[PDB]
Design a protein around this ligand. Structure first.
Ligand SMILES: NC(=O)c1ccc[n+]([C@@H]2O[C@H](COP(=O)([O-])OP(=O)(O)OC[C@H]3O[C@@H](n4cnc5c(N)ncnc54)[C@H](O)[C@@H]3O)[C@@H](O)[C@H]2O)c1
Ligand SMILES: NC(=O)c1ccc[n+]([C@@H]2O[C@H](COP(=O)([O-])OP(=O)(O)OC[C@H]3O[C@@H](n4cnc5c(N)ncnc54)[C@H](O)[C@@H]3O)[C@@H](O)[C@H]2O)c1
Lengths: 467, 465
């Protein structure tokens, strides 16, 4: 008795049918009523074609490009009878161009990342996010288009809101539950949240040993590698007193971010999750690092920022992905082959994904999901635990967009977090909040001299591994 | 067609330590030397070791050798007679130097695979200097072989064989050095700027990596101990840059520096034939100093005018790479550890060789590609890592029996051709391979880097920063 939330009265166009598309389609078929013959999947690959053929859904085997996207998508988006829904789960395509095409033709839109069509300041996820904010300022309101609504970016934005609420109660901080951005930002400031890690540990383990010269991951290899080779990026908090010599800022935009002139997936930070305890994460650039820091910014009269939390990814991927990164960076080039772990090839593990709020009176608080592969297989087909946290987030954003179809261009930080979590929670396994006394200065200084800041344990000076 | 018996041992054989290396060495000692079986006795404090020794039918004393008991224990055991005994030290937590000097005082031959203290001045440079000082204070005497495992040990022989091969491959004939100075000049004359001990262990386990367990193919305690020490290397005369946290030594042979950071968290760019380009870890090792020292050329005023860089570039097995990521990421040793047994290894090799670079053919790798499959067919109770070590101990023991009045010697002092003659049946494919790879391959990339394009093998380019 799965809930059928709404009818979709027009076409459903899924761009891309990889690990996430394969996990999202069965949720779309499960939770929405629609004209089955109006669903169409667009993907250039033959692996995708035969999978889509098995489910008997329309398949167009093409790569969407700058040259063909208009003539290819417009007739599909406007086929009626009612409002269609564009579900973009691809690599190598312009999120912004397809988003704007969907809007000007009255189709709803959702994606999980801002990327361009197939100089570090440009190409950064900060600049790409800025193109979306600019589009929203150019065409306020209108048809809803949800930008970056997967597990992270996406779900973690809702975890941050629930975490702040939990910290307010546990810290005896009194007041209404915020309902505006300005009020959320001030609540973060009042609780004394210096920064936030997106703190993730994937423990899914494969049934086969790691093959030589093969990159292995639990989701897009092409996407992860592309993101990991880009400069490390973070939302930059007002409490930070030090940045590295190779750090750089942005001349325009919301002003919430810096980047480092080194690749994110070869940049380690000291972080913590409940199952891993103290661990290394990689500082891989991500939309929510900027969007969450921007969302929680408090400005004064003259528009200057007086409070902003640090925010960045601290990603420990699966063991095979750690080995794949060691191999790739040590060889100096991409492996000649890659594979994504299928649920049939995973013997055990979880995708532990949450937000670690630190700097407040209880030191540090981690809130998020501990979804296991065994739980995943029980409640959803064709995906591993990583995929289901992403695919269920897309499902939640689609429900929200159907109930709020004229909200304009919106980020995950703009959605009603309680409604989105109500949709997603049946697919998240244990969702828990845990306090810890761990700090980045645990056990330090040790035998060797280090350039640490002992006045404040959570300074980025102390978090960043400086090899 | 049967195994060669190289020598009779006419006195007690005392094996100190029965971990992964001792377990692999005991069957080779039994196989290749003649002696009354009751002359051999193993000393180790571990219950696990005791049960295995019982199953192999050897005498076993369950005791830790310490500063307080080693004289009471080892002197009676090593002098039981009727002739000269052999102390085979394959332990952790014991003083190599103190046991070595005790064996020599009592006329027993000695061999070990590392210089360790009893459970600047704790560096492998300084530990090596105490052995050199012992040799100066007592020249001659009964042979004691220091640091004769796979690395340090065998790799010193590979360096010699590689220098001769480089000369031959250039058309230089009649190049057979006999003295230390002649070996150093050969390296200088061929233009060898440096040497990596370049290793890639591809042995894979039949079980996934357990959380909060350190996994390795040889000593976990020994590997973590070394890996947490400052990175150390022999420092070449061609080097024009060193990190800000590098430090030298006020005394000793002068061949070394160290970095104020743990070696097992220090990455260097390197290369092996099976790995191609890879990261290695710059773990401190005796041979990094001893080989650079051995190959040093001095002017009349006694200052070094030529010396090669030399250091470890170790890519351990996949589970050990994960184990180091976990250990350094948590800031503490895992609650448990295990060494992979040959029955737990599904496939792989231990590719261990020397990478000589800077000469006219850019880079030359020489060494062993021993597989776990071959290991099982030719020697019991060990994986491929263990067999490279145990067979090197075998070779050093043969040399010591054949040269019993040579005093304290390093692997660099032994007859390398004789030692490789004994060891090679256990090394699988032993190959030399040239490559055009350099540390500047593919660089600069997208990001600014402080590199030296005039000299791609500078440590400035090798060290990952
Ligand atoms: N926000 C999050 O939490 C999150 C999580 C995982 C993935 N993602 C993103 O979602 C996307 C999908 O990831 P995945 O694991 O499914 O990747 P994947 O590599 O498994 O699949 C990508 C698919 O896109 C297809 N494709 C390539 N070029 C195309 C084009 N020009 N037009 C249409 N399709 C094309 C490929 O054939 C492939 O089937 C990626 O962009 C990734 O960055 C976001
Ligand atoms: N040169 C090389 O190539 C090379 C290679 C591998 C190992 N090693 C060295 O060889 C030694 C043994 O390696 P391993 O893999 O067998 O290690 P291991 O950790 O498997 O075994 C060490 C053994 O020493 C025993 N021991 C501990 N304290 C003792 C004491 N006080 N007296 C006697 N025995 C004691 C332990 O019970 C254990 O059985 C280490 O010192 C290691 O660094 C050298």
């Amino acid at each position: 008795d799965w809930p059928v939330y709404h009818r979709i009265d027009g076409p459903i166009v899924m761009i891309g049918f990889g690990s996430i598309g394969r996990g999202t389609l069965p949720l779309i078929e499960r939770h929405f009523a629609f004209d089955r013959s109006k669903l169409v999947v667009i993907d250039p690959s033959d692996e995708a074609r035969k999978l889509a053929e098995a489910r008997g859904v329309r398949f167009i085997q093409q790569a969407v490009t700058r040259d063909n996207y208009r003539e290819l998508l417009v007739p599909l988006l406007t086929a009626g009878p009612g409002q269609g829904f564009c579900v973009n789960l691809s690599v190598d395509t312009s999120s912004l161009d397809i988003m704007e095409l969907a809007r000007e033709n009255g189709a709803l839109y959702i994606d999980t990342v801002v990327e361009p069509w197939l100089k570090p300041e440009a190409r950064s996820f900060y600049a790409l996010r800025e193109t979306v904010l600019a589009a929203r300022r150019n065409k306020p309101g209108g048809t809803t288009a949800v930008s970056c609504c997967g597990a992270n970016p996406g779900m973690v934005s809702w975890f941050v809101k629930q975490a702040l609420v939990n910290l307010a109660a546990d810290l005896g901080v009194t007041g209404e539950e915020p309902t505006t951005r300005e009020e959320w930002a001030r609540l973060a400031m009042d609780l004394g949240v210096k920064g936030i890690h997106i703190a993730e540990r994937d423990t899914q383990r494969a049934s086969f040993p790691k093959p030589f010269d093969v990159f292995v991951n639990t989701w897009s290899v092409e996407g992860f590698v592309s993101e990991g080779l880009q400069p490390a990026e973070l939302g930059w908090g007002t409490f930070e007193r030090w940045m590295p010599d190779n750090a750089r800022g942005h001349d325009s935009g919301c002003g919430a971010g810096i980047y480092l002139l080194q690749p994110g997936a070869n940049t380690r930070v000291r972080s913590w999750t409940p199952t891993a305890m103290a661990q290394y994460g990689f500082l891989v650039t991500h939309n929510e690092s900027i969007s969450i820091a921007d969302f929680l910014t408090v400005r004064d009269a003259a528009g200057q920022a007086v409070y902003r939390p640090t925010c960045h990814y601290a990603y420990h991927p699966c063991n095979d992905a750690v080995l794949s990164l060691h191999e790739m960076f040590g060889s100096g080039k991409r492996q000649s082959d890659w594979r994504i772990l299928d649920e049939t090839e995973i013997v055990d593990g979880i995708d532990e994904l949450g937000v670690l709020l630190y700097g407040h009176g209880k030191n540090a608080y981690w809130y998020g999901s501990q979804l296991s592969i065994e739980e995943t297989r029980r409640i959803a087909p064709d995906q591993n635990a990583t995929g289901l946290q992403v695919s269920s987030a897309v499902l939640a954003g689609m429900v929200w967009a159907l109930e709020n179809p004229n909200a304009g261009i919106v980020e995950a930080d703009d959605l009603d977090f309680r409604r989105c979590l109500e949709v997603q929670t049946p697919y998240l396994g244990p969702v828990v909040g845990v306090y810890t006394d761990w700090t980045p200065l645990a056990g330090r200084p040790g035998l060797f001299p280090e350039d640490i800041d002992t006045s404040d344990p959570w300074q980025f000076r102390n978090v960043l591994v400086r090899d």
